Design goal:
It is built from 5 helices and no strands. By secondary structure, it is mainly α. It is elongated. Bound molecules: ligand Y1D. It is classed as signaling protein.
Length: 119
């Protein structure tokens, strides 16, 4: 029922994501010279370095907020891809599956801890 435990659990999961070769395209913001039309398609860029820095700054209140930003990385890739058979989109789908498999317990434990706190 530790309502702070999610933060280190998220740090550790980001560390695992950074070790995954599938995270390579998502570790830093998209560059607007290599993909010059990116901001015509994507309103809110997001990447894993920005997620880690937001966490480490103490600017997430909950793991749900972190989860929303990570899911934005993946929805941006799906929106920008020219094909469902894209290399970088295909990497995003594997990485999303990995993320979702690991974040589920972090969310459940946090929400349970908070329900206990407010019992
Ligand atoms: O090259 C990058 N990011 C990047 C990373 C580090 C850098 F230094 C410079 C970069 F531009 N892509 C990431 C995700 N990508 C897609 O989601 C997508 C789907 C189909 C085709 O691209 C858009 C472009």
């Amino acid at each position: 029922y530790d309502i702070q435990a999610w933060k280190k659990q998220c740090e550790e999961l980001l560390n695992l994501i950074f070790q995954c070769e599938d995270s390579e395209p998502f570790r830093q913001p998209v560059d607007l010279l290599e993909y010059p039309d990116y901001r015509d398609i994507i309103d809110t860029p997001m990447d894993f370095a920005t997620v880690r820095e937001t966490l480490e700054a103490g600017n997430y209140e909950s793991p749900m907020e972190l989860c929303k930003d990570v899911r934005l990385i993946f929805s941006n890739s799906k929106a920008y891809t020219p094909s469902k058979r894209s290399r970088i989109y295909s990497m995003s789908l594997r990485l999303s599956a990995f993320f979702e498999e690991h974040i589920s317990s972090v969310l459940s434990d946090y929400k349970s801890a908070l329900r206990f706190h407010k019992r």
